[PDB]
């Protein structure tokens, strides 16, 4: 649930 998706094809967590 921590997912931060910053832009196309970019995931942290």
């Amino acid at each position: 649930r921590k997912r931060i998706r910053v832009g196309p094809g970019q995931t942290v967590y």
Partner: antibody
Amino acid sequence: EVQLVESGGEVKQPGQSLKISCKSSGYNFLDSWIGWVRQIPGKGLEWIGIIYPDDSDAHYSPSFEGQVTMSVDKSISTAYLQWTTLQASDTGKYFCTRLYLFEGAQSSNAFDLWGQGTMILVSS
Amino acid sequence: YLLTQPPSVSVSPGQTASISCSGDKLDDKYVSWYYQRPGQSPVLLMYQDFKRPSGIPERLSGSKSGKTATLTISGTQSLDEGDYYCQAWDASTGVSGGGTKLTVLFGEGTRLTVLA
């Protein structure tokens, strides 16, 4: 009523310590990031940082780091911002906010919830 | 990086206003926009470039092109006056390790005047 309720505005002398809070209800507190944003009267929006309530993982903006501490108390759905020593440049209205994880075949995040702000005026 | 917005835009009621938000990494970074009336808390208008969260009217639409995102308000009424902010993120790993460091960035905001 999903919402964020912050603590009262306050006047402080420089040198003093400080702790404002931000209280959560209406959704699952541990699961969404909390960010902090400052706004000097008449000025734009400035990012302070974000904190994950579940694990206290934290991200800080350079110009705030080491000057201000984010923390959360999980047992009371409450997030904190605190200054060990206050400066005049610390003046502003402080917003807490919930980063929401929107989902789809292309997920992402935006700050969809905002506390009402906490006015902090530092002055001799 | 930083987000550059026009300090102010003026529009006659019933016409269309565009608010631009340029930035060097914005061509691989989702952009969100926020409204804020003087005195009140900011409110989310748009996220992931062009998507409206529930309750925001169709007459508002976001877009992006190259290193410039845009918010567009058609049918501008007086109540639309106020400050508009774009925002995006940065994510980079530090040269010496320790995971991805996130940055939240905001444009300096655009004040919208509607000439009634």
